[PDB]
Symmetry: C2
Subunit: 406 residues, 2 copies
Amino acid sequence: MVDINLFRENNPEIIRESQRRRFASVEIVDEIIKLDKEWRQRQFEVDSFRKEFNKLNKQVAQLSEIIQQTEKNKQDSTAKEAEVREAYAALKAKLEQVGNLVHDSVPVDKDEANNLVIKLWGEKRFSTPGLKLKNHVDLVELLGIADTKRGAEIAGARGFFLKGDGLMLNQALINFGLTFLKKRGFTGLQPPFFMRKDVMAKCEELYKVTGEGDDKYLIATAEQPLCAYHIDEWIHPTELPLRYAGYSSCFRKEAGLGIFRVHQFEKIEQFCITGPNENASWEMLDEMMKNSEDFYQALKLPYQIVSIVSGALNDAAAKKYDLEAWFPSSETFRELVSCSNCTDYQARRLEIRYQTKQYVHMLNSTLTATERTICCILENYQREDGVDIPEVLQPFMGGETFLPFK
Amino acid sequence: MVDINLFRENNPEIIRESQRRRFASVEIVDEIIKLDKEWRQRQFEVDSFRKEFNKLNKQVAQLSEIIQQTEKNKQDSTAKEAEVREAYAALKAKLEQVGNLVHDSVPVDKDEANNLVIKLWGEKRFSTPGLKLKNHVDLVELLGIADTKRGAEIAGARGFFLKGDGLMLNQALINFGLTFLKKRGFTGLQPPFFMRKDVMAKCEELYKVTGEGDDKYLIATAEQPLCAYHIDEWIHPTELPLRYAGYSSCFRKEAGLGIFRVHQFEKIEQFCITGPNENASWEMLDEMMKNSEDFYQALKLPYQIVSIVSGALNDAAAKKYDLEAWFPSSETFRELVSCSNCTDYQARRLEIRYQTKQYVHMLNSTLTATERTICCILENYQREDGVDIPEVLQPFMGGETFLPFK
C-alpha cells in the first residue's frame, strides 16, 4: 500500500494524478480521505477517554460520583476502540486498491501498443525468401530436447519433459545466470516452491497445494517468496543495498505443443532491497536493467527495451521496463525480462522497516525464464542441420557447440 | 501386478512362497485362484455363445424357431460379458495387493534390523574425546547456507531456503550427478513436478494440486513420472536397455531445524528399462548399484551396502539394496540411495510391452538426494573453522575449496 500520509495536508493531488495515469479510480482518493478522517477522529476520541480517565482518576482530592464518570468513561472508550477497528478495516479495504505512485518519466498511455521503445541492441536475422527460419516449436521437436506429447499425457495440458541436451541447456543457463549475478554482487536464494496462504496474501491464478498444514499456493515466481523473506524485520542502513539472485521453478495456471507457453518453468530473478532516501532505488533499477542487458548481450540475442505504459503497470510498480527479445521466425519481439521498482509498496504491507517512520524500497527483475530464453536461443542460432550453442553457455556444457536435428 | 499365469497350472506355490517371505497374506493366493477360475469360466461361456450363435446362424439350411434361439442366445451372451466385467474387477482388486516375486537371494526376515550388510567402503571419522564433531543441523546454521526459520514462516513446517553456497553446492551436485550419468550412457529427463491423478494411480501421502484440469499430485520422486513415461507403448529389443537420468524437485508430506528431514528436496535418479529375458534386469541392477557406489566413492563419503529384508520390501520390488552413508556426529549410517529391480510389476500395470506375451523390466536407483548428500558432506568434511568442499565438486563451484563459519 501507498503511504496514508500522502492523502493528508496537492498532497492528495499527487495520488489523484497517479490514479489518472493508471486509468483507474480518481474518486477513490476522496473515499480514502473521508475514511482516513473518520479513522483519525475515532482514534482521537479514544485518546480523549484515556485523557478524561486519568484527569478523572487524578480528581480524587475530594476528601463519590466521579467514580461513576470513570465507570461510564471506561465503557464509552472500550466501545470506541472497536469503532477504530471498524474504521481502519474500511480504510484498508479501499487503500489496498490504490496503485503505487507512477513515476513522472513513465509514459502516460492506457494500452501497451504505446510502450515507449527506449533502446535497440543486436543485429537481427530475417527469414530469406524461400522458406522459413523454423520456430522454437519445430526446433524443439526436431532436436529431441523436450517431450511435449508425453508430458501432456502425464501432467495434463502444456506439460513437458526436458530431455537430453534440453536439460543440460536449462542447467547451463541456470548456472551461467547464477555465476553471472554472483560476480555482480548478488547472493543466491532458492525458496520453497510453496507459500502459506496468509503469506502469499501479502505478496487465485496460482495452483493450490493441500495439505500438511495451511493450504499453500505454488509460487508463480521467486519474487513472491523473496518478497516475504524479511517480513516484519528491520534492516540496518549498513545491510543495504541487498542483492539476492532468486532461483526457483515457477507454476502458472495462466499459460495463455512447445515449451514457451507452459504451466511450469524455471526462472532466475534479481531482487534488490535499498533504503528509501537518495534515489537509491532508482539507481538500483538502472543497475538491474544493465545486469539484464549484459546477459542477453552475453548471449548475443538481439532485443529492445520498452518502458511500460502507465495504464499497464501492475499495482506494486512505480515504473517498469521490459526487455523483449527478437524471435526470428515470427519476426517479433517477445518478453523475456521485466524489471520493476516497487519502492515501499510491498515494504509498507510487509512492515519492512528502515524520529521518522521509514521503509525499504524493493525491486525485481527477471534475468531468465530459461525455457523461454532457450526458445529464443534456438530460433536465433539455428542452421540447416541443427542449432549452435551460445558461446557463453558452451563451458556449462563442457563444451559442445552444436545440437543436431533429428 | 504379477503375472496371473503364475497362479495357473508349485506354479502358485512360488507366489505363496513369495507371500510368506513378505510376511503378508498367503490365503489371498487361494482367493485369486477361485477368482481367476470364475473370470476364466465366464469368458469361456461368452466364447460358447459366440460359438453357439454362429453354429445357429449357419443352421439356416432349413428351407423358424432357431432365430428365437438366436434372439435368446444374444441376450444370454450380452449379460455374461458384464459378468466378465464383474469377475475381472473382483480379480484385479485382490491381484493388485500381491507383492512382486521376491528373488531367492533376498534375506528372508521381517524387520530391517536384520538387513544384510554386504559391503563396507571408506575410512570413517569419529568424534575425539573432548567435543563433538558437529551435526549437519549446526553446520548448516554456522555456514549460513540455508534459512530454516524464514522458510518455515513462509512455507510452514520444515520449509527452507538455500542461500549463497548452499545453492551453488546443490547445483554443483546436480550437475556433477548429471554429467556423471551422461558419461555412463544415460539420457537426462526432467519431468513435470505434477502428475494427473489417474496416471499417478498406476505408478495420498503426496501433496494435491488444484487445478487447471484434473486434480494433480506433486511427485515424490522422478521415478514416478519416468515410470509413466512409456505407458501403453511397445519397446523394440533394439531400443533396450534404456538408461534415463531423472532429475526433479520432490515433494513429500511425510518428512518424519535443518535440511535432512524436509518436505521438498532435489533428487537425481537412475531409471533403467531392460528386456525381460536373459537376466538383463539383474545385470542392470548391479550396473546401477556400481554407478551409485562410484559416485559416493568419487565424493569420498564412507558407506555400507545393505540388502533389504523381504518383509520390508515395497510391492513393486523383487529385490532392493540401500547405500547408507556414514554420518560422523551421530556415528550412524543413513540412507542416501535405494536401488530396486521391479521387473515387470509396473510394466504389466502400465502395458509396457516387449507368439509370447512379454513385458519390459524396470529398475530405479537414487544417485543423490542432494540436500541429504550435502548433510553427509558437511559432517564428513568439517574442520574447526568451516567445511571443505569435495574435490569432484570443486570445478562445479569453479573452484572454491572451503566454506567458512560463521
